[PDB]
Structure 1
Amino acid sequence: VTTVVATPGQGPDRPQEVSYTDTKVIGNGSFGVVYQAKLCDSGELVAIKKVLQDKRELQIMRKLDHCNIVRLRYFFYSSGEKKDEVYLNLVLDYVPETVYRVARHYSRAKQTLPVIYVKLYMYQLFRSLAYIHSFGICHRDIKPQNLLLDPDTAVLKLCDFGSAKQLVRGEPNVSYICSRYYRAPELIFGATDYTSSIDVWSAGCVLAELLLGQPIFPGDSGVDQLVEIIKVLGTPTREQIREMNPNYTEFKFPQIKAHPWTKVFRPRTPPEAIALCSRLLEYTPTARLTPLEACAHSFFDELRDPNVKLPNGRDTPALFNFTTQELSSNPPLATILIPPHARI
């Protein structure tokens, strides 16, 4: 029942005994294995991610500090299933749900996720992206499963930095990255010089999925993923193909008309949600809004209303405590982002 381990963790390099109990398996996958546990001293729930080390998550997790990113409490090396292999354990903050599971509850119940939650969850996702992109860090795996959620407080926390990397101009990066459904079209065209706007495309895919109740681009392969994008956005132009990958020149594809954005979504869909979505799911990577510009979109105006409350009656979580680092990409947007009632 009680497991005792020694571990340094974030902040100062000082290993200490951490005792936890009520260990339970959350899930298994590409990430490794994630367990739920309770810290004995405080009685706080935590998520322990055990990963086998062979063949940058730790490096990135020790530097990040944000309200919409799951924090690293502690980290330790241990034994595991495989003898003589080294396993890294990340003790992170526990959040009970995922955007995937919450969206799946509403879909199975023939409902669309309420707009108030679509606004709250997307705003906090873009806010977490504005923060990591201000350090040049691209997540490269934005999807509903990686967006942790606390249903009662409506707090969203971005997790799983196992695909994350600091993008530097001049250094190439792998094109086969991101879960296929949320993969930006530059990556499909084999671009190695892509930017952090691949996460904005992936966030646009998450937004569209919450408005439709099912993935907008459910491709069965890298090639079929592009067919799903073309069926909605229409055939990309030469300029768009050059913008996505400057070294691709061989795209022969039939002329498919774009599906108008008003027709993609159901008639009850708010126009501002559609308008925001059209500025994220753009072929040209530079034409996409930055995460900080997405936060300042008119679709999130209700969150900036002094009288906004969650359906349960609680206040919204913290949305306007922006740091200077977080506003770096566009300091003048602080006028829109921090409303009159939230300033000082």
Structure 2
Amino acid sequence: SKVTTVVATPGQGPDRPQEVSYTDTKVIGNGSFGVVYQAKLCDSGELVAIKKVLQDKRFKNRELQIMRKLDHCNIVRLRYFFYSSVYLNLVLDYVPETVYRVARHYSRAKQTLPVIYVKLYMYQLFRSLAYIHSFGICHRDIKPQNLLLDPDTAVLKLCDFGSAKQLVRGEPNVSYICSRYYRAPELIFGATDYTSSIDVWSAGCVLAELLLGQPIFPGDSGVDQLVEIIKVLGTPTREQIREMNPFPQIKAHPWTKVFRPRTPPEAIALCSRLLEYTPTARLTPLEACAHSFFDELRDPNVKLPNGRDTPALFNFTTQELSSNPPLATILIPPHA
């Protein structure tokens, strides 16, 4: 079995390369960005994913620089990085599943994911967003494929920071980020002055899709997407439009009627508050963690269906809570 030994730089703390050996390298992904390999570290037998991307000669890699700053239980960990022949290689913790793959399994068994998992996956996503947003970092590509899962522990890790950017007021940013189905209306309308609330919309779309078993705003064009949105939210008022920034006439489909009939009311209430036209009316991620849909996760007796304890849910930091420190009394329950 072929070993690769490289001199790699730890992702966090002090810039101090060490020699790293790995084996059992195989391709696991292959989109636009480049390649993802899986490999096994010789020293520890730990499995890693290596995201290999072509490195611009001019610039510093933005994805890399954002990942070196991030340290959160619901975000994939940058273990090391190195250069090879010129390519940047991101050595990441290996995570075996994704929300996309798990959802599609229930979907084709004509079944929906049990709500305990909807609760767990969505809360952990909202945590990861609370954390990056506190740095003014917007992910800009929230979608089921980017939500990795460990099915055994029910841990969710956000990944793919290839579109992520710090958003600064008064700076314009490209409106062509983010994947179809998950794109906030302001993005569809071509705003360049959007905020981090675009992630919130994208998160509301994942929530709705886990509840429905299929995407809620599908469409091969902007127009078709907008019609699906209008069909649920009703036509946007002129003030709502000006708020998204840059003309069919439908009344709102009552959110209870959108979903199958045994759908928990707090689940629907949470969607209606994420999927708002006006970007400033959307819940923040921290507010979303504190919503009553997630109350069962705050129950001292909650367990995973495999009989394990829930994963880490309450270890908030001052950084993570900073958008609204008083939510801590809701978020960290008596027993935690």
What TM-score does the superposition give when structure 1 sets the normalisation length? 0.93
Say yes or no: does 1:289 pair with 2:295: no
Q: Is the 8 A contact 2:8 2:81 kept in 1?
A: no
* Mapping 1:47-196, distance limit 5 Å: 47-54=49-56, 57-79=63-85, 86-196=86-196
Question: Which whole-Å CA distance do the structure 2 matches of 1:168 and 1:9 have between them?
Answer: 25
- Number of matched pairs: 330
Q: CA separation in 2, counterparts of 1:159 and 1:140?
A: 12
Aligned residues of 1:131 and 1:326 also touching (Cα < 8 A): yes
> Which shows bigger deviation, 299-308 or 49-58?
49-58
Pair 1:114–1:20, CA change in 2 (3 A): same
In structure 2, stretches of 5+ residues that fail to align are none
> What is the deviation of 1:233?
1.3
Q: Post-superposition shift, 1:30?
A: 2.1
Task: Report the aligned-residue RMSD.
Answer: 1.4
Cα pair 1:31 1:160 within 8 Å, conserved = no
Q: CA deviation at 1:49?
A: 0.3
CA displacement 1:69-102 (0-9 Å, x = unmatched): 00100011111xxxxxx11110001110000000
Q: CA deviation at 1:317?
A: 0.3
Report how far residue 320 of structure 1 moved. 0.5
Shift of 1:123: 0.1
Report the Cα distance in structure 2 between the residues aligned to 1:224 and 1:127, rounded to whole angstroms.
31
Show structure 1 runs of 5+ residues with no match.
Answer: 80-85, 247-252
CA contact (8 A) 1:53 1:87 kept: yes
Distance 1:37 1:24 in 2: 7
CA–CA distance in structure 1, aligned partners of residues 190 and 323 of structure 2:
27
Cα distance, 1:13 vs structure 2: 0.7
1:296, 1:337 within 8 Å by CA — same for their partners in 2? yes
In structure 1, distance between residues paired with 2:87 and 2:173: 26
Alpha carbons 1:6, 1:76 under 8 Å: kept: yes
Could you tell me how far 1:296 is from its partner in structure 2? 0.2
Equivalent pair of 1:141/1:199 in contact (CA under 8 Å): yes
Shift of 1:9: 3.3
Contact map agreement 2:5 2:19 (CA 8 A) in 1: no
1:239 aligned partner:
239
TM-aligned CA distance change 1:277 to 1:55, over 3 Å: farther
Instruction: Show CA shifts across 1:165-202 (max 9, x none).
Output: 00000110011110011000011111111110000000
For the residue of structure 1 that corresponds to 2:20, the secondary structure is strand
Tell me if structure 2 keeps the 8 A contact 1:4–1:17. Answer: yes
Q: Identity over aligned residues, as a percent?
A: 100
Tell me the distance in 1 between the aligned counterparts of 2:138 and 2:270.
Answer: 21
| TM-score normalised to structure 2 length | 0.96
**For residues 141 and 55 of structure 1, do their structure 2 counterparts lie closer, same or farther at Cα, with a shift above 3 Å needed?**
farther
What is the alpha-carbon distance in structure 2 between the residues aligned to residue 225 and residue 30 of structure 1?
23
Indicate conservation of the 8 Å contact 2:9/2:15, yes or no: no
Q: Deviations over 1:250-293 (max 9, x none)?
A: xxx12112211111110011111000010000001001000000
In the TM superposition, residue 24 of structure 1 has moved relative to its aligned partner by: 1.2
Q: Quick check: 156-165 or 12-21, which moved more? A: 12-21
Q: How far apart are the structure 2 equivalents of 1:6 and 1:67? A: 23
